[PDB]
């Protein structure tokens, strides 16, 4: 539990291709909950050969773009990928550039960071895409008024593994853009009790 610790960066992009709809790449910015939501279109599939081979290239791609739109101060310490096949090619686009030497690691896959693809304002944003959008999501709400970082984070990760074993149940218990309901503390704790 100390990715409250600095501000790490988890990559997840094994939904990029979902059969006959479009993909998400999704990057959780542990320090402070920023979630970026990026929606890959079913165009980029058309007519491919490997999905592997385009998917690990442009989940490297859309990182170096995330790390170009950010100031100096907010660039992430270390970067996690769920998937080691992109841990290369990141590393090819980041020779040579201001983001070498950040930490590039693997080992995010024990994080079902991909099961919030089952949030139905993310589903629902996805689907009726039209281009390759982003978005950014507060994945912390308003916790940080009222737990300490660690507690957000942690809350954030048994959020994740119950969407990923029990989908239907966390949307039954629960309900710039909040990724989950304004709800009080207590809520949140009875919550937290009955997600297993």
Known sequence: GDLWRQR?????????????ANGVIWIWETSTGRLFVKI??????????????????????????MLRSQPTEELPRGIVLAQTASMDPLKTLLAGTEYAKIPVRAGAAAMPLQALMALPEIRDRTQTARSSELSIWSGYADWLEHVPVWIASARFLLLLHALDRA????????????????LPETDWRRLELELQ
Not at 8 to 20: G, M
């Open 40 to 65: 890959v279109h079913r165009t980029t599939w058309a007519g491919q050969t490997r999905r592997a081979q385009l998917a690990k290239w442009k989940c490297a791609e859309h990182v170096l773009t």
């Open 8 to 20: 790490l960066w988890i990559v997840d992009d094994r939904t990029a291709y979902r059969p006959h």
């Open 167 to 182: 989908p239907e149940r966390v949307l039954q218990l629960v309900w710039t853009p909040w990724l989950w309901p304004a």
